[PDB]
Amino acid sequence: DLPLDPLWEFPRDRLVLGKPLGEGAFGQVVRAEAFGMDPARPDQASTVAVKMLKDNASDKDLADLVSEMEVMKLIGRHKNIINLLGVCTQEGPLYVILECAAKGNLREFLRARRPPGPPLSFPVLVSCAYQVARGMQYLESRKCIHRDLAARNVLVTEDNVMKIADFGLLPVKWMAPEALFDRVYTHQSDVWSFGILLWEIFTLGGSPYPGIPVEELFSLLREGHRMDRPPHCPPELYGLMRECWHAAPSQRPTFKQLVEALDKVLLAV
Ligand SMILES: C[C@@H](Oc1ccc2[nH]nc(/C=C/c3cnn(CCO)c3)c2c1)c1c(Cl)cncc1Cl
């Protein structure tokens, strides 16, 4: 439709699609082989992920999709986020090219390598948490947010780099109380979800509030109850979870303070 952005346009001729990766609600994501995404070398053929409208399309699907593409242009590169590589708006159907995370999302990454009984050593788990904290701090600094913030929304590269998916200016067990009841989202509500994700990591991909149907959960939070410390999880990291789950948002740590705490934990080597 419109227009041509020379900072981002990529010719479809050097883009052969491949097997689907997953969906959706905004668009199908396929694996794809791209030729010459790094123009220092017109030969090196690296893989990417490509986002497209599925086809009984919209009228609320192309709208946010192009809105999604414009948002990623403005934030720019960061190591701990799914970066935008190029776009194809010149010959018909819209393609959005992004970095490929070979190992799927964080929750699948953890559960697939789970032990059978009583790889994912302690520093790797801290490494995952530190990286996601680094990504969320950057997003907040660009006055952008990510309300969802579950392990299923963090992708893992071939090199165990954590990259947050989705960017912009019913998953009820991850949501801070004010976003759950008052329906208001802040940077401090993001920190609540990070605590839940912290717990997702050190249970190696467990389900939050296990055995609890999602309803009465609000009463237990009102009663001051939080999830217990997972086994073999050190009390320092459970202390951070409890700080992320403090009822008052101003009593919660900011993403800066969570990066320093996790950094001090990684430095223990
Ligand atoms: C809907 C999908 O969006 C994206 C967006 C950018 C991406 N860059 N790279 C991948 C690789 C996906 C993959 C590679 N292996 N596997 C099997 C793993 O079980 C899945 C990928 C997926 C998604 C998925 Cl597929 C998963 N979680 C979150 C999201 Cl948003």
Which structural domain range is residue 89 located in? 1-100
Specify the experimental method: X-ray
If you measure from the C-alpha of residue 45 to the centroid of ligand 1, how many angstroms do you get, rounded to a whole number? Answer: 20
Q: Which atom of ligand 1 sits closest to the CA of residue 105?
A: 27
Give the closest residue to 31 by CA, choosing from 112, 125, 107, 99: 99
For residues 154 and 205, the answer to whether their CB atoms sit within 8 Å is: no
Q: Which atom of ligand 1 is nearest to the CA of 49?
A: 8
Please check whether residues 24 and 56 belong to one and the same domain. Answer: yes
Residue appearing with tokens 């070979």: 102
Measure CA of the first residue to CA of the last residue in the chain; give whole Å. Answer: 54
Q: What angle do CA 85, 156, 234 make, to 5 degrees?
A: 140
- Total structural domains in the chain? 2
Nearest residue (by CA) to ligand 1, atom 2, is: 22
Q: In terms of domains, do 210 and 247 share one?
A: yes
Q: Is 13 exposed, middle or buried (0-12, 13-18, 19+ CB in 10 A)?
A: exposed
Residue 13 annotated to the active site: no
Domain CATH number, residue 246: 1.10.510.10
Token pair, residue 48, equals 């990417």
| Domain closes at, from 100, 115, 143 | 100
Choosing from 17, 68, 105 the residue with most ligand 1 atoms within 8 A of its CB, the one to mutate for a pocket test is: 105
Token pair 């999302």: residue:
105
